[PDB]
Amino acid sequence: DREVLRVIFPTGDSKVVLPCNLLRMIWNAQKIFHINPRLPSDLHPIKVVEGVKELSKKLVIVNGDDPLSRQAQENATLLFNIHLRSTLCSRRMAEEFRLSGEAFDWLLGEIESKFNQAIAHPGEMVGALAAQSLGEPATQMKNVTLGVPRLKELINISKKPKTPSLTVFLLGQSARDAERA
């Protein structure tokens, strides 16, 4: 999962946008179930492993059992399953989050409910929503063209931009040496 993440995010930006806030849900479970973080917990690590597996089976975006459906379902929840496994580790739930059995079961139920509440409702007019989500900030907007004129240059496909430009990256020691640069 880490190798997949480093392929997906080559710049090292760990900030993602994901449906269920797992860290805050864990904190919620700690406060709800009065989890003492200085005591040994009654949560078996195998319960963490099998619960994360069953939960990942229970968060379905693409339905069916066709291998095409299975691959699409795996792709649609790849980051969320990676993040769910990285957050609900057996190591992290034992030494860092210290949740109990009841708190872990509640956590799995909460992640289920809050993921299913996040799935897009069919019938939602998302094209108009996108057009109002990209045009409303436009009311609040090297000689690189930027702001509203560059937005107009982008959505009206212009054969001649105002300032066409390249971003040439250099392959080899010419990237380091200024003189062969």
Partner: protein, 78 residues
Amino acid sequence: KRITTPYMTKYERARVLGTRALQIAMCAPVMVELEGETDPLLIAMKELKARKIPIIIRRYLPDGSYEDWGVDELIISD
């Protein structure tokens, strides 16, 4: 055989509540034990919460095919 979501969407919730409220305002038989409320939309609300609304949602697929889901067959968690 039914591939659509088991959760009743917000649009289905709004339209089912409006249709049921218009029916109750047009003297449809109420299906919940009403404790003296007059508003047809509140009656439709608590029929939906009691999952006793007698309406079937026909979800049209992009094929032209459709799935008929009961209002009591759906999840009204939202």
